[PDB]
Subunit: 259 residues, 4 copies
């Protein structure tokens, strides 16, 4: 079937990619970076994030695989020594798929984005003020550095550094965390992270300034004349190729406690 | 149908209970505290917690209602002024039910318990050491004051004070938080709260001392010769009587931000 | 003696300022905004911060007074109703002085700055990497959103929202807090806030990018070709006019717990 | 001069102690565990804590030295390989002294205690309620698991696990941290850690139950009919023998970041 391989760009990743293409040539496997059914990322979690966004319009027709040439990643969880074994078991089709939920982001002035990790909103300097509306009722007026809405698999990333909980990716949900909120008699926020199920809509609305720094995964965009930022669990999902058991809590333990 | 009413025990709650019994007498409603189909708690969230444990063996056949004679509670979310309206709409059967997940706790020396809020494990003095095992693999060796496993509706209680996330109760899950863990080159814990889906089993195992203070909701028990404490989302659920929309995030906003 | 009054710029502050000038005209008090011995700020803590920086080159010859036309401030701790009483007791010289420590910031490419609240260092987009050196020995390699070095009186401001401790201003010290650090096997930071005595020097050194967003109190500057940012408790101090006992912990209680 | 050596009690510590006594016998050094001028602890920080409390009535006449037979300690900061060098430089008197502040604790029913690390107050089950009074004015009504008042050198211990700041021991101060406080419309606490200078008195006062678990360093005592617990920086100080530069921030880096 059609496949493609993206590389971090260093020597180790480029030549592991060239070796996998060589092994793939020994099978009924055609290299196509326009309509691949298999997308292989060689590098780190950042390389995988780029691969996901490179093919975000054909998610339902693509199985992703991540190979880490450096340390273990949460998406690049395959060791380079297993690269040759990846080729055969994947040419035969000896694999099922696991799917992780995604975060849908709507920005109105309208544009929509999908996030694999998180989407954040920050000020164009100093602190900013936004009204947080949950399912069309006002929840809080936030003043601080920013807010972060994370996918389940994204909770080990920016969300973790902001004090959020780590969620197993089988839970279809999204998590909101605060960035240095000021809490006093005037401004009052919940403080705790909030975990939302599907079909719940979190809306951020501007108060004074309407220019915000909006990020989706590794991409950071300055948006102007923004009227609303809406978050909800996407109906779409990213599909991974599964060849072996590597549980989420194992990857958490191996990444943060010790390998 | 058969009903019963428990009271906090103060003057205001006892006489609101006596007035509801009087109004119930004006309907085909029989008072029975052995096999009630409707359990009404008048007081606070603590009174409701007692009512839940008083009838935890007939959960599948009971609809709970909470009335707060003091401030708003997350379970006692009905105001005493609406007590008379509660009687009629509930004698007619003009209500459906909403169900919140529960936490199952197994203590082996074997005893099982259900928690509506959380279950905690603490030392018999100073810090304690337990091995945390997730789905039969060792995750961490915890040294500190204790651990807390919370239901979704329990996240606004002890879990919130421990830095956990607030989870909407439609998510069938459980959340684990740490109590003052010591983190150094020797002892290493994740720090972040952990949210587990159904069918995931978290096991706490003793290292040196085998005597622990184990709590389930408001009840605190000292347990000796404990070999294991296992947590997982229960197959059982608590059923509430629903007469009106009072969203979980509204109760969060009203309780912690302002009413 | 020579005095001056700065105003927030709203109607209430401008006309309280005009009334104080009128009352001052009834005394041997000359209005001079070039060499005042008394600087009165009418508005909020932000107005006071501007007044401090407006006269930061004559700190040793100026006594500051803060009046809050809105809610209570930590520097604007005088109520507008006591404005007329402020005039007389201050024309007579019936007051001593209290002094709060300041933070010295040296930026090398060299420029020096004084902060009454704090000084922060942030990235020009995403996370940044700086080496933290304490008294000429490498302490940690920080990767995250930023760092914040606070004065004692500044601990109730940005420092508080970052999890720092509240320090009584009689302690000559500075406090460093982290902004969403990533902690893993690669990058390791202390996490806890750090409190430094006098004569201790904290140096931030660039790793890759050398362009940082450096802030000192309300002013935020983008600095390029930065080689080092050094922090230490300043030898200079800000001097307040003291007419009455208003303890620091009282202002903390009144501001954050309830007035 | 008169000296004594305490041991953790394991094989390695007992025989390093026997070797140091042998080396001391080769000098004008008399072993006396009643009036020693030099107290040597061999083991861990816990062994040193016991040695400090064993001789807390002769602090002004004793210089302490800590040797760690396991990992590096903040008090046991001497490696066993340097034991023989410790003997000579210390028989000659080729050393000055450094002094760390201590915490004074007064319990009234009256008893006084000195803490090298911290003193904590906890409930006899569940949460407890105490009024916090700072310098004779009511600061907050705390409801939660407990409170912790730490010395500067104690901030790397229980205080660190509770979110407190790390303070250099040259600062004469004490730091208070909270243990899982409940914060709502009813109960309101500051949340942030509080750092107090000398001569400031923090008083904890009972509300309902008057039975508390009071700890001072490694000793935990249940106290009954307690009317008040008062904390302030002690006028006394512990004196260390100084043979070489080992800065506090180096010990922090070596203990928590990497050795
Ligand atoms: N394996 C570790 C390496 O992978 C990174 N990583 C990634 C990634 C990536 C590519 O860069 C952009 C990400 O920067 C993260 N980030 C930003 N600002 C951050 C901060 N202030 N604090 C922590 N994070 C921050 C956001 O989340 C962005 O999405 N995703 C994950 C994940 N899901 N889980 C665990 N690690 C993950 C991680 O950062 C490590 O570098
Ligand atoms: N409405 C507010 C009042 O109701 C209480 N409450 C309850 C309850 C109850 C009955 O007492 C036992 C509970 O004490 C909580 N708890 C213990 N130690 C705590 C601590 N150190 N810190 C915060 N909590 C603590 C645990 O969770 C126990 O289960 N349940 C909830 C809930 N689900 N959400 C919001 N509040 C709730 C709350 O405490 C208020 O008093
Ligand atoms: N009285 C309350 C009002 O006064 C403000 N205030 C000030 C001030 C001021 C003028 O603006 C710039 C300050 O913005 C603060 N800040 C920035 N980003 C922040 C964030 N993300 N989170 C919290 N803070 C933040 C930084 O500290 C800057 O210095 N100083 C203090 C103080 N010392 N103590 C208590 N409040 C103080 C406070 O912000 C309230 O508005
Ligand atoms: N070197 C590391 C070893 O030394 C210990 N240690 C000690 C000590 C000791 C002897 O035991 C009693 C101490 O238990 C600590 N403690 C209790 N409950 C704790 C918890 N829930 N969380 C973290 N702490 C806790 C309290 O503080 C008690 O005083 N003092 C210090 C110190 N000053 N700095 C750094 N480590 C120190 C540390 O615990 C390690 O074991």
């Amino acid at each position: 079937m059609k496949y493609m391989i993206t590389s971090k760009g260093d020597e180790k990743s480029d030549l592991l990619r060239l070796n996998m293409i060589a092994g793939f040539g020994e099978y009924d496997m055609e290299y196509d970076d326009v309509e691949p059914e298999i997308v292989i990322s060689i590098g780190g979690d950042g390389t995988f994030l780029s691969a996901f966004h490179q093919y975000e319009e054909r998610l339902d027709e693509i199985a992703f695989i991540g190979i880490h040439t450096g340390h273990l990643g949460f998406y690049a969880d395959w060791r380079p020594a297993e690269a040759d074994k990846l080729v055969k078991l994947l040419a035969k089709g000896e694999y099922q798929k696991v799917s992780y939920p995604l975060l849908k982001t709507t920005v109105k002035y309208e544009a929509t984005y999908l996030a694999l990790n998180e989407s954040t909103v920050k000020s164009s300097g100093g602190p900013f003020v936004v009204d947080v509306v949950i399912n069309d009722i006002h929840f809080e007026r936030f003043r601080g550095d920013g807010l972060c809405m994370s996918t389940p698999s994204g909770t080990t990333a920016y969300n973790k550094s902001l004090g959020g909980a780590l969620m197993h990716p089988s839970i279809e949900a999204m998590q909101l965390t605060e960035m240095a909120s000021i809490n006093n008699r005037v401004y009052r926020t919940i403080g705790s992270p909030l975990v939302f199920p599907k079909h719940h809509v979190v809306s951020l609305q501007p108060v004074n300034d309407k220019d915000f720094q909006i990020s989706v995964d590794h991409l950071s965009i300055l948006h102007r004349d923004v009227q609303e930022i809406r978050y909800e669990v996407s109906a779409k999902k990213i599909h991974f190729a599964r060849f072996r058991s590597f549980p989420f809590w194992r990857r958490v333990h191996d990444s943060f406690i010790e390998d």
